[PDB]
């Protein structure tokens, strides 16, 4: 440090154009202003519940491929925030849109949803803990910069309905999760070759592409 | 009643119909497809096949029976090693460097990622079901294009049609069909539905692959 | 039900002779009476901490291979009981034997330890959720019948040092964990062929053999 | 300094020494080993090789480079397909049924489970390191037994010694050695220590395998 290349910053820069497209996407801008049609948001949070279920499985690969109790613990904690969290952003909107437990059980993921979660899983499974750390990063990191951007429109945070979502993904606690993921990737890659770095960049960019397509399909509901 | 292979076939015939009548695919059968689109397809399919071979290696690790281990191992070799793609690598002027530098498209990565992930989350049944659409649909596509006519006699496209409708290719598909049937005779109703879901998801990806290939 | 074969009972019966050998093993009988040399127990709880770390990874395979939120949640909860449980039986003896965090970090698993955890992992990875459910069952189930047996010597529960261990593995809460694992295996195998059942039996017996060898190596410390 | 392959070799030479001088192994080299113990070994090693091939399939799935995918795939075929075990299947009277009904011993299952688990938890480096001891130690064992003499000329045991000291077998070991070296030139000190730990763990399992084979 700090005359040395940081791989997280390198991945960040390569994903900027894509995350900018996510920020100005009609679905996301709809959340910021408060104009997004309420059933389009409903469709999204159902799809996102399904998405989060598969996302948890990638973190579980983290537990298996981590060789360090502390990082196993960190991956295990991330799974709990998805599965055992009645305070989570998702369980808030589930009761606000009065979505039934049977509707959740009966819902099908869209192709765009399946493709994304398959990609993270398959790359996790073909690689090591570096690939799992890189595969899960776009999702949290992009949601953070999206929410920090939306966090000033203004009235975006004060919105009676959509305020909770923007506040949730911009909170100090969610920041700490993204920071953990960033730090983990940086600490795992100190000795990585140029070719390895390019592999991780490719994963990070691909998942960023999937995020854009996820917002798209949520809007095209 | 009905074999599970036939049950999955029945539920995908509609998608395979759309594949057969796709501009790219009819393009092969009547020689209208532009060489530049087929070139792009061939590079992508090469990349595709490298990831597809991995699903078969997954079959080696999950097979708990020496006979099917061996069958999966031979399928890896067949995929890798007088291949259709080589012919077209030579016929077009695709270099070894061009192949190594090539990037798979989103549609390509999604499809192979999906087969891998389902294979890894499930058992030998799920890997057998995940790889079946690819082979079987090419067989029926090639059998359909075969009777156009002058499809087989075409100086450029003939080889592709001949290859995927051959006796040896049909035997590979038949192995995959019979394996799935023999792995599933004790499967519950819910298991069969899961396998059906995989088989139609992959058929959708096949359609998107041809589509992606046509956009170039 | 109940004129139908229960696969858990079938596995149980095939493992009885082995679990009986575990019950009357010098190490385990040492716990029951209270005579087990204290540094032999120390060696064991270090090895068992290492063991539990790998055991958690098998439960993580459970999260990835479960296709049902409820069972994912159940596997995730099991991981937490290993990693985020300062009330766990292990963290009790860690402070009682004043075992340092650095000693835990520096400790090597024995072959017998490595072999067992490798076997559960590899079978989990080669199979489906049925194999993971079968691979983790011996450990909890044998510890339960061991503790229920030791639970009457008497004075075994009242022992100032070893009492905590016997009480812990015989508690209503640990019973509920074993019951969950048993129920899960039974519900996953309703349609299993004879050949599949034999595969799961073989896993269950093998892990039972490893348990006996684990106690052995803990005694031969 | 030193190649990592040589570094692992150095740290295991002591265990391989114990393997070379083991009663079972010296038994092969001087024709004293009883046919019944070798028969038992051959059934076990067959079972062993079936699981070992799976670690190589794991190499196919984790190789992110077409050349090494192909090398791993060929290694699966070589393991499966004029094999040493076949010769001894025929020479002794081991039936196809006897092989299918055979159970691997604890020592057998532990060893293969260990290679699988480390391969799956890690990357292509860890699979290359996990499979190396097996091939390399057999090479040095066979090279040692070769000069006894009359070891090679022995009517029963000659073939085994000839096979594991052959040009083609040495080339397989050399591939595995060179692959590990080329996969690790950017590895940190801690990574090298991890790989060393795997390599000596597997060497210990090799010793326990010969031991298990001698107990029958």
CB contact set of B9 (below 8 Å; sequence gap of 6+): B136
Backbone angle region of D144, left / alpha / beta, with phi > 0 → left and psi within -120 to 50 → alpha: alpha
CB burial of residue A180 (10 Å; 0-12, 13-18, 19+): middle
Min distance C120 CA to chain D CA atoms (Å):
8
Two tokens at B65? Answer: 């029976």
The residue among C126, C129, C193 with the most chain B CBs within 10 A of its CB, best to mutate, is C126
The residue among D4, D68, D122, D193 with the most chain A CBs within 10 A of its CB, best to mutate, is D122
> Which residues in chain B are closer than 8 Å to A126, comparing Cβ atoms?
54, 116
Q: Cα separation of A82 and A220, whole Å?
A: 26
Q: Are C163 and C157 in contact, with CB atoms under 8 Å apart?
A: yes
Nearest CA in chain A to B54: A126
> Which residues in chain D are closer than 8 Å to B73, comparing Cβ atoms?
53, 57, 73, 76-77, 80
Catalytic residue among C139, C158, C173, C177: C139
Q: Cα separation of C19 and C215, whole Å?
A: 11
- Out of C61, C83, C121, the one facing A73 most closely (by C-beta) is C83
In chain D, the domains with their CATH numbers are 1-216 (1.20.910.10)
The residue among C122, C201, C202 with the most chain D CBs within 10 A of its CB, best to mutate, is C122
Catalytic residue among B34, B134, B172, B191: B134
What subunits make at least 3 CB pairs under 8 angstroms with D? A, B, C
Report yes or no: A64 at the D interface, CB cutoff 8 Å.
Answer: yes
Two tokens at D162? Answer: 């000839």
Reduce the secondary structure of A116-135 to three states and give it as a string: HHHHHHHHHHHCCHHHHHHH
Contact between chains at B120 and A119 (C-beta distance less than 8 A): no
DSSP SS3 for C221: coil
Contact between chains at C190 and B187 (C-beta distance less than 8 A): no
Q: Cα separation of B121 and C128, whole Å?
A: 7
- Active-site residue D51, yes or no? no
Contact between chains at D187 and A191 (C-beta distance less than 8 A): yes
Nearest CA-CA partner of A71 in A116, A141, A15, A128: A128
Q: Cα separation of C85 and D17, whole Å?
A: 46
Reduce the secondary structure of B46-77 to three states and give it as a string: HHHHHHHHHHHHHHHHHCCCHHHHHHHHHHHH
Indicate if the alpha-carbon torsion angle C203, C209, C211, C217 is positive or negative: negative
The contacts found for C180-184 with CB under 8 angstroms, 24 or more apart, are C180/C74, C181/C133, C181/C136, C181/C137, C181/C140, C181/C141, C182/C8, C182/C137, C182/C141, C184/C71, C184/C74, C184/C133
Q: Cα separation of D70 and D68, whole Å?
A: 5
Q: Which method, experimentally, gave rise to this model? A: X-ray
Q: Cα separation of D115 and D119, whole Å?
A: 6
CB burial of residue D190 (10 Å; 0-12, 13-18, 19+): exposed
Q: Cα separation of B151 and B158, whole Å?
A: 6
> Which residues in chain B are closer than 8 Å to C199, comparing Cβ atoms?
64
Q: Cα separation of B87 and B82, whole Å?
A: 7
For residue C68, what is the DSSP state? Answer: S
- Out of A57, A115, A213, the one facing B113 most closely (by C-beta) is A115
Two tokens at C125? Answer: 């990875």
**Annotated binding residue at C81?**
no
Report yes or no: A192 at the D interface, CB cutoff 8 Å.
Answer: yes
Indicate if the alpha-carbon torsion angle C212, C213, C214, C219 is positive or negative: positive
What is the count of residue pairs from A and C with beta carbons less than 8 Å apart? Answer: 53
**Annotated binding residue at C48?**
yes
Q: Cα separation of B169 and B176, whole Å?
A: 11
Element (H, E) at C141: helix C137-150
Displacement of CA A86 from its chain's centroid (Å): 19
CB contact set of A139 (below 8 Å; sequence gap of 6+): A55, A207, A211
CB contacts under 8 A, D 93-112 vs C, are 106, 109-110, 112
Q: Cα separation of C144 and C173, whole Å?
A: 11
Displacement of CA A85 from its chain's centroid (Å): 16
Buried b / exposed e across A72-83, counting CB within 10 Å, b at 16+?
A: bbbbbbbbbbbb
Resolution (Å) of this entry:
2.4
Nearest CA-CA partner of B138 in B8, B3, B25, B7: B25
Other C-beta atoms closer than 10 Å to the C-beta of A106 total: 9
Element (H, E) at C158: none
The annotation places the binding site of B at 45, 138, 164
First to last CA, chain A: 46
Contact between chains at B117 and A118 (C-beta distance less than 8 A): yes
- Looking at chain C, the residues that come just before a C–N gap of over 2.5 A are none
The annotation places the binding site of B for substrate at 45, 138, 164
Nearest CA in chain A to B205: A111
Q: Are B139 and B169 in contact, with CB atoms under 8 Å apart?
A: yes
Nearest CA in chain C to D208: C111
CB burial of residue D87 (10 Å; 0-12, 13-18, 19+): middle
- Active-site residue B134, yes or no? yes
């Amino acid at each position: 440090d700090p005359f040395t290349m940081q791989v997280s910053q390198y991945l960040y820069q390569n994903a900027q154009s894509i995350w900018g497209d996510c920020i100005s996407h009609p679905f996301v801008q709809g959340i910021g202003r408060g104009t997004l049609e309420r059933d389009k948001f409903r469709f999204y949070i159902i799809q996102d519940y399904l998405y989060l279920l598969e996302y948890a499985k990638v973190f579980a690969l983290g537990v298996v491929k981590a060789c360090d109790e502390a990082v196993m613990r960190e991956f295990s904690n991330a799974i709990q925030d998805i599965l055992n969290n009645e305070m989570s952003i998702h369980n808030h909107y589930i009761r606000e849109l009065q979505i039934t437990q049977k509707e959740l059980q009966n819902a099908c993921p869209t192709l765009a949803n399946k493709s994304y979660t398959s990609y993270m899983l398959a790359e996790g499974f073909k690689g090591s803990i570096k690939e799992v750390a890189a595969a899960v990063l776009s999702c949290g990191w992009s949601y953070l910069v999206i929410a920090q951007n939306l966090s000033q429109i203004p009235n975006a945070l004060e919105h009676a309905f959509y305020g909770h979502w923007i506040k949730g993904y911009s909170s100090k606690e969610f920041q700490a999760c993204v920071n953990w993921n960033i730090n983990l990737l940086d600490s795992l890659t100190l000795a990585s070759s140029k070719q390895e770095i390019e592999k991780l960049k490719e994963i990070f960019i691909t998942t960023s592409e999937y995020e854009y397509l996820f917002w798209d399909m949520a809007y095209q509901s």
